[PDB]
Amino acid sequence: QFNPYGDNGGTILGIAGEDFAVLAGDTRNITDYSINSRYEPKVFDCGDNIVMSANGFAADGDALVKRFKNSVKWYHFDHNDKKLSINSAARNIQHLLYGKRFFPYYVHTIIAGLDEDGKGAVYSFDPVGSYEREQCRAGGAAASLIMPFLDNQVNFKNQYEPGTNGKVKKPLKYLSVEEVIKLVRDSFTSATERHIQVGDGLEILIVTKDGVRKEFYELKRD
Amino acid sequence: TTTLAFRFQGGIIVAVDSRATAGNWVASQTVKKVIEINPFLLGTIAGGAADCQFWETWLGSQCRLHELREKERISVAAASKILSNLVYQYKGAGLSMGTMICGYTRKEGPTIYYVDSDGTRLKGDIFCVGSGQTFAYGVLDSNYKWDLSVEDALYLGKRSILAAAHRDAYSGGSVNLYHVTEDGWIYHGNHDVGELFWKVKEEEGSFNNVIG
Amino acid sequence: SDPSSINGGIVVAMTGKDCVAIACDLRLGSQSLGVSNKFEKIFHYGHVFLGITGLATDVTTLNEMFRYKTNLYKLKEERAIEPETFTQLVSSSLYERRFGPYFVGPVVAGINSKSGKPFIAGFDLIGCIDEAKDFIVSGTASDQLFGMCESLYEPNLEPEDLFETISQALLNAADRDALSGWGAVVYIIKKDEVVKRYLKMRQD
Amino acid sequence: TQQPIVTGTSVISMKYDNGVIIAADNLGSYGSLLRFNGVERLIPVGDNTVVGISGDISDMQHIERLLKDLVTENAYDNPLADAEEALEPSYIFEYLATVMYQRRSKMNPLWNAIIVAGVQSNGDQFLRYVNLLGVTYSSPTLATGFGAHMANPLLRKVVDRESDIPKTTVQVAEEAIVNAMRVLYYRDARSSRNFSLAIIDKNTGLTFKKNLQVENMKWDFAKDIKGYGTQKI
Amino acid sequence: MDIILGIRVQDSVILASSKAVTRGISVLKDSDDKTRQLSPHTLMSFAGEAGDTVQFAEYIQANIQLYSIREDYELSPQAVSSFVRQELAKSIRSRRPYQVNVLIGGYDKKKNKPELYQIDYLGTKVELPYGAHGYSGFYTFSLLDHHYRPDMTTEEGLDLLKLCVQELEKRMPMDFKGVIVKIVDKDGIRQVDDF
Amino acid sequence: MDIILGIRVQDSVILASSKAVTRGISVLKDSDDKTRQLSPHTLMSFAGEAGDTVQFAEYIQANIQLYSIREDYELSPQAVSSFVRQELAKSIRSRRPYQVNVLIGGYDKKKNKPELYQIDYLGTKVELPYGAHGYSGFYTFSLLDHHYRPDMTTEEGLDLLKLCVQELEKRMPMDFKGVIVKIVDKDGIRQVDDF
Amino acid sequence: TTIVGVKFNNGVVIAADTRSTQGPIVADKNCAKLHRISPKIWCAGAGTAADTEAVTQLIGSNIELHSLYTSREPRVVSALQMLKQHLFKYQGHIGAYLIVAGVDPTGSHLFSIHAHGSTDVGYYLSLGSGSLAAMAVLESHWKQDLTKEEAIKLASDAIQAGIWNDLGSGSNVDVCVMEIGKDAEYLRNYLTPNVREEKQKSYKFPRGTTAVLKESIVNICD
Amino acid sequence: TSIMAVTFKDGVILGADSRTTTGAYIANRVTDKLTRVHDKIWCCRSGSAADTQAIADIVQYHLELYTSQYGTPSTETAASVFKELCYENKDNLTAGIIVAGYDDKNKGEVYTIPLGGSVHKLPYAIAGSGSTFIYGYCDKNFRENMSKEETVDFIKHSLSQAIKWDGSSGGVIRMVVLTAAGVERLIFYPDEYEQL
Amino acid sequence: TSIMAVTFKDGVILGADSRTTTGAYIANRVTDKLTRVHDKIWCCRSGSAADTQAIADIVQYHLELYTSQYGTPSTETAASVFKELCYENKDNLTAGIIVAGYDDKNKGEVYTIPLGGSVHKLPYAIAGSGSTFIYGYCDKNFRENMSKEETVDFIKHSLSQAIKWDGSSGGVIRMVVLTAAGVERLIFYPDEYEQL
Ligand SMILES: *[C@@](C)(CO)[C@](*)(O)[C@H](Cc1ccccc1)NC(=O)[C@H](Cc1ccc(OC)cc1)NC(=O)[C@H](C)NC(=O)CN1CCOCC1
Ligand SMILES: *[C@@](C)(CO)[C@](*)(O)[C@H](Cc1ccccc1)NC(=O)[C@H](Cc1ccc(OC)cc1)NC(=O)[C@H](C)NC(=O)CN1CCOCC1
Ligand SMILES: *[C@@](C)(CO)[C@](*)(O)[C@H](Cc1ccccc1)NC(=O)[C@H](Cc1ccc(OC)cc1)NC(=O)[C@H](C)NC(=O)CN1CCOCC1
Ligand SMILES: *[C@@](C)(CO)[C@](*)(O)[C@H](Cc1ccccc1)NC(=O)[C@H](Cc1ccc(OC)cc1)NC(=O)[C@H](C)NC(=O)CN1CCOCC1
Ligand SMILES: [Mg+2]
Ligand SMILES: [Mg+2]
Numbered sequence A: 001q002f003n004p005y006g007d008n009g010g011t012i013l014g015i016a017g018e019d020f021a022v023l024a025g026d027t028r029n030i031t032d033y034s035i036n037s038r039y040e041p042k043v044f045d046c047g048d049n050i051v052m053s054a055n056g057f058a059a060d061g062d063a064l065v066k067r068f069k070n071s072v073k074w075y076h077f078d079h080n081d082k083k084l085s086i087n088s089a090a091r092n093i094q095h096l097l098y099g100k101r102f103f104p105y106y107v108h109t110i111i112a113g114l115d116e117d118g119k120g121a122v123y124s125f126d127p128v129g130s131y132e133r134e135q136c137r138a139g140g141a142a143a144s145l146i147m148p149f150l151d152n153q154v155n156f157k158n159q160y161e162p163g164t165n166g167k168v169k170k171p172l173k174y175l176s177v178e179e180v181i182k183l184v185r186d187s188f189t190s191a192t193e194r195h196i197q198v199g200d201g202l203e204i205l206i207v208t209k210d211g212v213r214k215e216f217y218e219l220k221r222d
Numbered sequence B: 001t002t003t004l005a006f007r008f009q010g011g012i013i014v015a016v017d018s019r020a021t022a023g024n025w026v027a028s029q030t031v032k033k034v035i036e037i038n039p040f041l042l043g044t045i046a047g048g049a050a051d052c053q054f055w056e057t058w059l060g061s062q063c064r065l066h067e068l069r070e071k072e073r074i075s076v077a078a079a080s081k082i083l084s085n086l087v088y089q090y091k092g093a094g095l096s097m098g099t100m101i102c103g104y105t106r107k108e109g110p111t112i113y114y115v116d117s118d119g120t121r122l123k124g125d126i127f128c129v130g131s132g133q134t135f136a137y138g139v140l141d142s143n144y145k146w147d148l149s150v151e152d153a154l155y156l157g158k159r160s161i162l163a164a165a166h167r168d169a170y171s172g173g174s175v176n177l178y179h180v181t182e183d184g185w186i187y188h189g190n191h192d193v194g195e196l197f198w199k200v201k202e203e204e205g206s207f208n209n210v211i212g
Numbered sequence C: 001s002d003p004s005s006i007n008g009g010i011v012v013a014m015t016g017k018d019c020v021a022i023a024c025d026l027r028l029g030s031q032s033l034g035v036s037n038k039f040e041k042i043f044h045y046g047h048v049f050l051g052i053t054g055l056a057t058d059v060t061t062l063n064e065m066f067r068y069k070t071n072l073y074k075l076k077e078e079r080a081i082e083p084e085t086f087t088q089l090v091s092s093s094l095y096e097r098r099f100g101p102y103f104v105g106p107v108v109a110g111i112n113s114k115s116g117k118p119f120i121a122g123f124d125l126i127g128c129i130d131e132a133k134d135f136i137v138s139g140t141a142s143d144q145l146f147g148m149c150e151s152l153y154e155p156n157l158e159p160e161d162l163f164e165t166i167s168q169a170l171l172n173a174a175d176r177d178a179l180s181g182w183g184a185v186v187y188i189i190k191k192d193e194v195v196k197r198y199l200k201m202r203q204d
Numbered sequence D: 001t002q003q004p005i006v007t008g009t010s011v012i013s014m015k016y017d018n019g020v021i022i023a024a025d026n027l028g029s030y031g032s033l034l035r036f037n038g039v040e041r042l043i044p045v046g047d048n049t050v051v052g053i054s055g056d057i058s059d060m061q062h063i064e065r066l067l068k069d070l071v072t073e074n075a076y077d078n079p080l081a082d083a084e085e086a087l088e089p090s091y092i093f094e095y096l097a098t099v100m101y102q103r104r105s106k107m108n109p110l111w112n113a114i115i116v117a118g119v120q121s122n123g124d125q126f127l128r129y130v131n132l133l134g135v136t137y138s139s140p141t142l143a144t145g146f147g148a149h150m151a152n153p154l155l156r157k158v159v160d161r162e163s164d165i166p167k168t169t170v171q172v173a174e175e176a177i178v179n180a181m182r183v184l185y186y187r188d189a190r191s192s193r194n195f196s197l198a199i200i201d202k203n204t205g206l207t208f209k210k211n212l213q214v215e216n217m218k219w220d221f222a223k224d225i226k227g228y229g230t231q232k233i
Numbered sequence E, F: 001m002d003i004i005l006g007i008r009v010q011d012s013v014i015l016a017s018s019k020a021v022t023r024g025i026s027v028l029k030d031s032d033d034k035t036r037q038l039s040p041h042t043l044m045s046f047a048g049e050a051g052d053t054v055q056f057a058e059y060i061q062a063n064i065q066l067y068s069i070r071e072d073y074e075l076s077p078q079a080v081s082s083f084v085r086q087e088l089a090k091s092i093r094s095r096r097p098y099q100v101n102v103l104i105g106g107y108d109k110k111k112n113k114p115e116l117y118q119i120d121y122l123g124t125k126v127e128l129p130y131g132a133h134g135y136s137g138f139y140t141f142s143l144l145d146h147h148y149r150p151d152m153t154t155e156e157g158l159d160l161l162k163l164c165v166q167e168l169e170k171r172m173p174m175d176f177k178g179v180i181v182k183i184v185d186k187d188g189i190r191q192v193d194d195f
Numbered sequence G: 001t002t003i004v005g006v007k008f009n010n011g012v013v014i015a016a017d018t019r020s021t022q023g024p025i026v027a028d029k030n031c032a033k034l035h036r037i038s039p040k041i042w043c044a045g046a047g048t049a050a051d052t053e054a055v056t057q058l059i060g061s062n063i064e065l066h067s068l069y070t071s072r073e074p075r076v077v078s079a080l081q082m083l084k085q086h087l088f089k090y091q092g093h094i095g096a097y098l099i100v101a102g103v104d105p106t107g108s109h110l111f112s113i114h115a116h117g118s119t120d121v122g123y124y125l126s127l128g129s130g131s132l133a134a135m136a137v138l139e140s141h142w143k144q145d146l147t148k149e150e151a152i153k154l155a156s157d158a159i160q161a162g163i164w165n166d167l168g169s170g171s172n173v174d175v176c177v178m179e180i181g182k183d184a185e186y187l188r189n190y191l192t193p194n195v196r197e198e199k200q201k202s203y204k205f206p207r208g209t210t211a212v213l214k215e216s217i218v219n220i221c222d
Numbered sequence H, I: 001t002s003i004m005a006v007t008f009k010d011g012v013i014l015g016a017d018s019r020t021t022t023g024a025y026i027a028n029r030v031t032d033k034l035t036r037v038h039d040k041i042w043c044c045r046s047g048s049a050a051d052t053q054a055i056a057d058i059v060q061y062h063l064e065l066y067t068s069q070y071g072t073p074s075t076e077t078a079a080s081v082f083k084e085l086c087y088e089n090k091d092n093l094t095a096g097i098i099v100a101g102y103d104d105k106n107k108g109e110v111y112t113i114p115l116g117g118s119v120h121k122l123p124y125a126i127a128g129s130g131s132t133f134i135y136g137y138c139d140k141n142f143r144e145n146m147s148k149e150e151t152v153d154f155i156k157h158s159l160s161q162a163i164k165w166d167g168s169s170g171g172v173i174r175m176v177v178l179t180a181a182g183v184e185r186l187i188f189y190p191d192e193y194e195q196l
């Protein structure tokens, strides 16, 4: 019998700073045990300082991004070129996903950008439209590997202040763009070591008030 | 999920956990399971995350349209029945929703309505809904009285979620407290189980099963 | 009805400079119901330490079995069994039940008393030995542990530092798994002293 | 819900310095039966694009008609149909990709794997893949079916990344493709000796080669092999 | 067979077990005692598949009584629980396993300490301050997490047990026809007739 | 939803309906009223699939009330029961049928006679001196076969009903949390508060 | 797995990758798939990991006892016969896919065995998930009358094809050369083209970061 | 597989392709499907490689032990041993075997043993997946008491067609000639037989 | 079924057996599987009798309506209409049809349409259950630009073998000759073709 879904592998990662936000994703694309492409981007600039990635089944992923990109376009036409805020984009995406509740897009979606106070924002979705704003989110095949590392290093979970008898927690603070990119690169190299569907290359999209910058890094090709 | 809400002398207490699951994977620890429909209406949610989130946000829109059309805030009964009639249309399609529409109006007084995705709609004084409802019921029922103070009632709701957060593997993260009075709902803060458990253990002398 | 994920639990092991560490959580449940918060998963036979995850009845049975076998070993050999030798014994015993296996994920850890070399190893349920320089992971949050260990770990860590790394690897991995947690224990093993520490972790 | 009946096997392709190469054998299999031997599975669109199709042949013939009809429709009310407003490889691909995904979304797929090879108007090499699921991807080398498993490894030794494309000539690239086709003939049970090859260069244009054969085959070592183990005679 | 509870307090172990025996849409009996005395200071309650439960309980009882006669000595609760666990651990990989869950409440005379062991049909043993099998645990564990203290008396333990039964009678779907309560301490085993 | 009974006596119809609403291993409510007043002298109790029950009961209620307003006249119990049956008879061959069983107790003011109708989810109507849906009937029918007389009073009918509830509380596996009893006679519908 | 075997002038060479998988996760990044049956008879294993280890040890044990009984150096055909009869008896349930090779008084030999107990003979062979990637290379570059150095190159190249192009294979290349008249040389980690790059950051925690409840000395002595 | 055995004036000739498949992948393109169970008693193997191989080994063992006690066995005897194994284990085997041998008294003989485990003595026999495509050709072209060169051409042309149409058949065409003269191995490559 | 169509010098000839089976029972032993969709455009039907019959009737209707408006249709046009029906209803049909026709410009033409609904223009075509057994024979014996007598012999010998080996084929051998001369029906009985 025909099976309409497939698994294209890979993994994605979003981190928010004080005045910036990053959305990273590996450039590998696979089916079963074969590599389809070593460089197939899945993190996209969607305009209005919103970056998006829908990792899982690439056909559904591309379809969704394509529809959201189109949603942004028609938002400008219908509302006098108004900038789509990150919170508004997130709610719009929920309706796109939930629209296919009974024949879902097999993707874990993450968007990143700046909120209306100019502060870094990461939103993340389940396949059918459930969403939540966070400082931190990993998605995709290697999400189970990367996410707990982020809890530890971004939100300082399970870390206490030395010599305080485990009574005072390590204080929360924003990370610099330099420190965030370090965590991203280490997250992906670690994931590449232990997950077969992750590797080849890493592409990071950084979002500041100035615009959207890109950075590329090699990953292990085995 | 574990969610509860109970009626008492001083209004309604509403308490929920904050964990989301994808099987045995902990998807989140910081999820909002109380939707604020209006200053006098709250909706707890349990079940499918998207179904709950989507349809309760939708419910709020229908309640807003009611007060625009009728120049009057919607009743708790009418609000709960909009949602129950909606899910009933989808009966069999596979929606998963366990909600408790809690609020106050002049004609009704403090009212709680249990509504779920297979069409059941029940008015009542006490309800616990979710994977850890039984754990919450155990603590809540054994300590419940109508004459509880606002201070004691708030704590009992908090302590009941904590109990379930501990035992139920699919509940935890943190406790979100609310108190509904004649003047509307009042938020009583987010309480992380990471600190709350040990605070309760030490002060109350409970949780002797755990290695202190 | 998946034996490996009924009771829940995790074990992790690491090497350092002239030392090894092995750690485990304390949860035993029946699917969603948490039952016990005292269920330790690490055992020792002389100076050789064995951690076991998976179906709890088999965890208990295998501990009793390896105690049995190592006791007879010591009586006949007139010496304590070494980690390398014990690793082979575990593999033999698991593969003996090839078509009716113990649903477990064992982890051997210890320092060879003759050479002084730190040693760790892991197994699948059927006996396949997984030897490693750096670390071994096992249990319902193995994916999580792999991610934590692969990023946090570095070679030649001192015992006091190694304790922090392994503890943080376990704690943060356990908090992303529903069937793991509810307390934790860490063994720091030096050539001729062993320190056992109970960690404070979130109880949900 | 379909099942493929008459099927075509591997389609292989790669980029080189000035353009792209694509190839596919001339077989129409009917399960294990090698039923039809004169099947062309490379279909040119204009003088700058070649669509290579594997999978169900009935659906391939449907796609042929769609492309044939696309050329006609593009010519309507279009004075620049053979110039600035000619059909690009990217246009042809996106059209097919749209169809493939729409059909899978209706649970009635075109049971194929497609590779669109061509050269754009600005000289850029175009090479992209799409299949019955609507999954799309691009790479310096692309292959379908057994080609993905056996051809790609060989073609990636020539062009392993983007920077290797300018360093690869048409002579080197074609030789790798022809070698890959031989390896596939050795090892794919639903392949044939006869095949077609197409080169789309930005300078010399479209060169379509028919009735090629796998040659220089190593079979001589077979005579020394006896039994499966202990047998000597 | 459904509800079996256990609470270990300062100087005793208290076992509560439901009296209902149901088959189909009929409660065949409402006065059923779901325990066996394994030895003078060791009591085992049980619940599970029909027939298997009593057959297993009595089989264990026979073996422990045989040991007592042979050695003229009572086996410790820890030793009995280990024996029981091993029997269930054998069973689970048999042609037809015993589908029986048990609680073993005993008073160790050498240590002068009460002990409560919870063992499921797989052979999963745990020592606990309080235990339960079946759906009961989903209510009683959280309740006991709150109200239990380690230094409680037997009388306090019975009130704590009454609190569990009341909750179960309120929230459980099935009518389990109340419970038979038994206390295990230094003076042996005795039944609370009025509960 | 589980236990709904009905007894027609000399001058009235008595409906008894269980108060429990259960889902999973939790009794969510123990004071649930499983009836709707269709008209001043006609009462319908119901039981079946969750959601369907109330949705159907209220839908019927709305239709009968609409008829009452339009004609300024109360429909006879026989007429109401026929309308209800037809709705269920349509339902059973729908895409998703109402899985609801009902009892319709009414007092016919023209005939001065009480009437009890039993209709299942298939649209199977029968007029009876006493009726029941679900597993209740397996106990109550034989009991009423013995103790029922056609010329009984309402007070005698309530004692006869108490005899049924006692038997169900003794032999039924599930705790149905007692019953709400309602009487339908020449003076209309009223609820017995102490049962 | 990816495993190969190549015959040459005066002997035979076998090779293998060093990746072990459980699902999509890499269980072991440097496992040993080349197995010694006897001093000059070695065996490359693919399939169920424990089965390849167990079946090769069992036959190796019985080969040793046979060699002592007969006062003769063991032959490859004996190992072949014992392996296939064992595997056949278990009707494929022992999931071992082996390439058996070695030198003995009869000469140099190269065979493959499948889990169900069927054996093949060849000058070049490949088994495992990356056998197609390897066989593509072997079919392209193999010729009659290979030298020792040429055979090692061809074998390792065939393993590399699996390492890079197959997700079920990775890490390093192990080789074992079995030449006639000489000792068999086992080249553990002959190539290591997948070295982990320097991490961006050291995650060494400040001492006292972890909260502790209890301490105790464990007694390991008598 | 495509396999066949053909009797002729001087004896009998066995023929086979060289393709082994695991699905659509060719695991071995130079397979030897003609196997010796005795000096001048050979067989063609089709079906499960593991099964036919295990059977042929047992038969070889039985006939070696027969020869030690009772001298050279007949071709019929060999076929009987094959049958006994195939028939008694029919539930667990997928083996279609053609037995061919040369006696001096009985000359060339061919016995075919299909899946069921039945025995059929024939002038010539064809079997395996690719044999379906050459029933028509072989029936029209076979003659009794052919010469060696005629029989080699008959097998070569037959297997050439079987290979051409069957995807599960291919590679080289191996043949084994059984006569009073001795045993002769023949091979024929694609470049020759494809263009017949 | 066994069916075939063969082009030759003067035009094209269609051939077929006459056996219709419902399981192992022969429902009709004198079936006419060669059907007219136009004056000199005929087809051979294999697969489901009901399906191929319903299709052929629709095609006959379309070509009659084509002739009323645009004059005589080409053989290619006829094959296209068959294809359109077979392809678009592939999920609900089991029809393997061979279309054969004679134009004056294009001479003899043969199009085969397998289960999928694909079209294949060929010099000759074979189809149906019994065709498997004659791929070898037909490939070796077919030549282009044969005479009428040669083509009749080719079809007769081919279908004779297909019938001999296929249980689902039998009875008489019907043939239909399409040339400029006109349309000629031929029949051949068992007593003749069996002993070829
Ligand atoms: C507890 C954790 C029980 O799991 C709660 O019910 C919790 C409530 C909640 C409310 C708001 C936001 C988040 C969470 N529910 C979940 O965490 C929920 C559990 C669940 C999963 C699947 C279900 O099948 C219908 C029913 C309940 N988790 C999710 O919804 C997760 C995050 N998402 C998915 O599993 C995505 N699936 C949903 C079903 O459709 C396919 C995709
Ligand atoms: C490559 C990696 C396959 O992807 C190789 O075949 C490799 C061979 C090998 C040999 C010796 C030492 C290490 C590695 N095989 C594996 O790594 C193997 C992959 C595999 C998983 C499941 C299989 O069948 C269900 C077959 C092959 N991995 C394992 O054997 C791991 C260590 N164990 C398991 O996955 C658990 N087993 C338990 C026994 O039942 C099968 C699953
Ligand atoms: C042709 C290819 C098919 O008819 C031949 O019969 C050929 C005969 C042969 C092969 C090698 C040496 C001598 C003779 N058979 C095969 O190539 C055979 C195909 C086959 C597989 C399974 C069968 O049913 C059990 C029947 C035929 N190939 C194999 O045996 C290969 C080596 N193994 C597999 O494909 C794995 N099988 C094992 C059995 O279970 C299914 C998977
Ligand atoms: C030979 C016999 C088989 O290949 C031919 O194809 C022949 C073609 C033919 C028959 C009559 C007139 C013109 C052409 N086909 C049959 O004889 C056919 C066999 C067949 C049955 C079902 C099939 O799949 C749907 C395919 C082939 N026989 C029939 O159609 C007979 C009349 N009916 C049945 O056997 C009843 N079938 C109806 C379809 O569902 C299964 C039961
Ligand atoms: Mg790889
Ligand atoms: Mg929890």
Ligand SMILES: [Mg+2]
Pocket: I163, I164, I165, I166, I167, I168, I169, I170
């Ligand atoms: Mg016939």
